[PDB]
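To the wet lab folks,

You asked to see what we're planning to order before we commit. Fair enough. Below is the target structure as tokens, and below that is the sequence we designed to fit it. If anything looks off to you, flag it before the synthesis order goes out.
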């Protein structure tokens, strides 16, 4: 059960009670290599918990799987009760929100992404387009020099009142196979798809933990992702 004095909080919390099925679709194009990814799994916002398996449906993924983790559903974050009035992501549901990013891989190319996150029936759907340009053919991305792992990370969320949405910018660190690190500097904005009211948050952050694995029975190119996201940074 859920029980909040704000009916707008109640509306979003009710959509994310229990376990929610997730579908992810990504059509990408990086330096002229077209590819698609399909993902399926479940989210349990009560615990900030996501379990997803992604398949490259065009063959071999032309970029490293870790580079797509942030692109491939922050509505499943756990917002503490005393912060639920700051949960933009659930408040935009079920009509959804647009998530847009530019991801600058330092000394390399950049990803431009646009996604619509919304419910289709009971299923939470993340449909994405990605364009990657100016990548080095022998760089860490197109050369597949990134390790298959991921680090824990905090992203700070700010309101974007001009756009009735939010924005964030943050740096992801990708381990390179020779010990060093590839930086991926993310700029992010989110806006509601509908014109109904949303919750615009005070400044806070999301604390993320991600674990990547492989399905030993899966011959297609794939990534198994376990992710926890918790909102923080506002006191009681």
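Sequence we intend to order:
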């Amino acid at each position: 059960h859920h029980h909040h004095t704000d009916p707008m909080v109640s509306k979003g919390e009710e959509l994310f009670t229990g376990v929610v099925p997730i579908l992810v679709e990504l059509d990408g194009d990086v330096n002229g290599h077209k590819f698609s990814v399909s993902g399926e799994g479940e989210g349990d916002a009560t615990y900030g918990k996501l379990t997803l398996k992604f398949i490259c449906t065009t063959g071999k993924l032309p970029v490293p799987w870790p580079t797509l983790v942030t692109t491939l559903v922050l509505c499943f974050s756990r917002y503490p009760d005393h912060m639920k009035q700051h949960d933009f992501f659930k408040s935009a549901m079920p009509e959804g929100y647009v998530q847009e990013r530019t991801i600058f891989f330092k000394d390399d190319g950049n990803y431009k992404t646009r996604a619509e996150v919304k419910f289709e029936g009971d299923t939470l759907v993340n449909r994405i387009e990605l364009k990657g340009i100016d990548f080095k053919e022998d760089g860490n991305i197109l050369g597949h020099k990134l390790e298959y792992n991921y680090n824990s990370h905090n992203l700070y969320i700010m309101a974007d009142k001009q756009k009735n949405g939010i924005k964030s910018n943050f740096k992801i660190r990708h381990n390179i196979e020779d010990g060093s690190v590839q930086l991926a500097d993310h700029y992010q904005q989110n806006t509601p798809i509908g014109d109904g009211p949303v919750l615009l948050p005070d400044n806070h952050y999301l604390s993320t933990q991600s674990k990547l694995s492989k399905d030993p029975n899966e011959k297609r190119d794939h990534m198994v992702l376990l992710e926890f996201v918790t909102a923080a940074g506002i006191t009681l």
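Structural context that might help your review: The longest strand covers residues 33-44. The CA atoms of residues 154 and 207 lie 5 Å apart.

Thanks,
Computational group
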